[PDB]
């Protein structure tokens, strides 16, 4: 807790929901607060919320930590969307992304849980990443395939204990790791490298439910600087204006 940085990150009671304080995120579209999380949207059809940090982060190397929770009621496979986590230009801007605009400006980290695609090879609910430098749009109807950096197949609805995931971005890697499984552990899902964006980008969450539905809740959204070095010639560079990209290795 020496490196949480209280200002990119969403604690209970949530600042200055329930007291004269200042909030430090936005609340859009469905979402609505209790004392005890956070829900983008209720199990309930047609629904789009988001929460958006007031503050642009301007750390280069950061882990977030989410708990969240989704659940709900529907039989069989009849439950959906997901949720989507964005480190993103802009914010509030609601969209047809997992409750947020499309074409967007960074990274989002989806939790798809309805396999939209029918002639899908991947195993759901499914976690995956994907950089945008706003000429990209998630195919909704094939789950992103075409623009799918990388995922994983990860088991997060209706467990009987908490589910967290933590995603870390330093020196162009990023990780995202999973805590599903109540071992008090973090397994790994995406672990790649090349990966370009900017400092000062909003961190946000949303959640999108169509002709399916479920309970997308956000418990706490913690981030913690990591304390890594950059020699000075790393650091003269603006880091604001580094275009989202990846560089990949060759074949
Ligand atoms: O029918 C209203 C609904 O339409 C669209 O959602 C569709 C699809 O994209 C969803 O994955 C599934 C499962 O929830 O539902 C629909 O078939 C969207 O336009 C959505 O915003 C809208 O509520
Ligand atoms: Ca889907
Ligand atoms: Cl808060
Ligand atoms: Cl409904
Ligand atoms: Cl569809
Ligand atoms: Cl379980
Ligand atoms: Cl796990």
Same mark, same amino acid.
């Given at each position: 807790?020496?490196?949480?940085?209280?200002?990119?990150?969403?604690?209970?009671?949530?600042?200055?929901?329930?007291?004269?304080?200042?909030?430090?995120?936005?609340?859009?579209?469905?979402?609505?607060?209790?004392?005890?999380?956070?829900?983008?949207?209720?199990?309930?059809?047609?629904?789009?919320?988001?929460?958006?940090?007031?503050?642009?982060?301007?750390?280069?190397?950061?882990?977030?930590?989410?708990?969240?929770?989704?659940?709900?009621?529907?039989?069989?496979?009849?439950?959906?969307?997901?949720? +989507?986590?964005?480190?993103?230009?802009?914010?509030?801007?609601?969209?047809?992304?997992?409750?947020?605009?499309?074409?967007?400006?960074?990274? +989002?980290?989806?939790?798809?849980?309805?396999?939209?695609?029918?002639?899908?090879?991947? *195993?759901?609910?499914?976690?995956? *990443?994907?950089?945008?430098?706003?000429?990209?749009?998630?195919?909704?109807?094939?789950?992103?395939?075409?623009?799918?950096?990388?995922?994983?197949? +990860?088991?997060?609805?209706?467990?009987?204990?908490?589910?967290?995931?933590?995603?870390?971005?330093?020196?162009?890697?990023?990780?995202?790791?999973?805590?599903?499984?109540? &071992?008090?552990?973090?397994?790994?899902?995406?672990?790649?490298?090349?990966?370009?964006?900017?400092?000062?980008?909003?961190?946000? +969450?949303?959640?999108?439910?169509?002709?399916?539905?479920?309970?997308?809740?956000?418990?706490?959204?913690?981030?913690?600087?990591?304390?890594?070095?950059?020699?000075?010639?790393?650091?003269?560079?603006?880091?604001? &204006?580094?275009?989202?990209?990846?560089?990949?290795?060759?074949?």
């Amino acid at each position: 807790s020496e490196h949480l940085k209280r200002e990119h990150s969403l604690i209970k009671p949530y600042q200055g929901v329930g007291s004269s304080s200042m909030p430090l995120w936005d609340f859009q579209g469905s979402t609505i607060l209790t004392s005890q999380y956070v829900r983008l949207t209720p199990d309930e059809r047609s629904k789009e919320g988001s929460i958006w940090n007031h503050q642009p982060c301007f750390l280069k190397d950061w882990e977030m930590h989410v708990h969240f929770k989704v659940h709900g009621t529907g039989k069989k496979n009849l439950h959906g969307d997901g949720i +989507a986590l964005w480190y993103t230009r802009d914010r509030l801007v609601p969209g047809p992304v997992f409750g947020s605009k499309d074409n967007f400006h960074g990274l +989002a980290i989806f939790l798809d849980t309805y396999p939209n695609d029918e002639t899908t090879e991947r *195993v759901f609910p499914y976690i995956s *990443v994907m950089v945008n430098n706003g000429s990209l749009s998630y195919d909704h109807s094939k789950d992103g395939r075409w623009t799918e950096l990388a995922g994983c197949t +990860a088991d997060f609805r209706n467990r009987d204990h908490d589910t967290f995931l933590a995603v870390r971005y330093s020196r162009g890697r990023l990780t995202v790791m999973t805590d599903l499984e109540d &071992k008090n552990e973090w397994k790994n899902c995406i672990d790649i490298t090349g990966v370009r964006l900017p400092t000062g980008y909003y961190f946000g +969450a949303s959640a999108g439910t169509g002709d399916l539905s479920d309970n997308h809740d956000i418990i706490s959204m913690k981030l913690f600087q990591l304390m890594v070095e950059h020699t000075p010639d790393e650091e003269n560079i603006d880091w604001t &204006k580094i275009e989202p990209s990846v560089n990949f290795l060759k074949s």
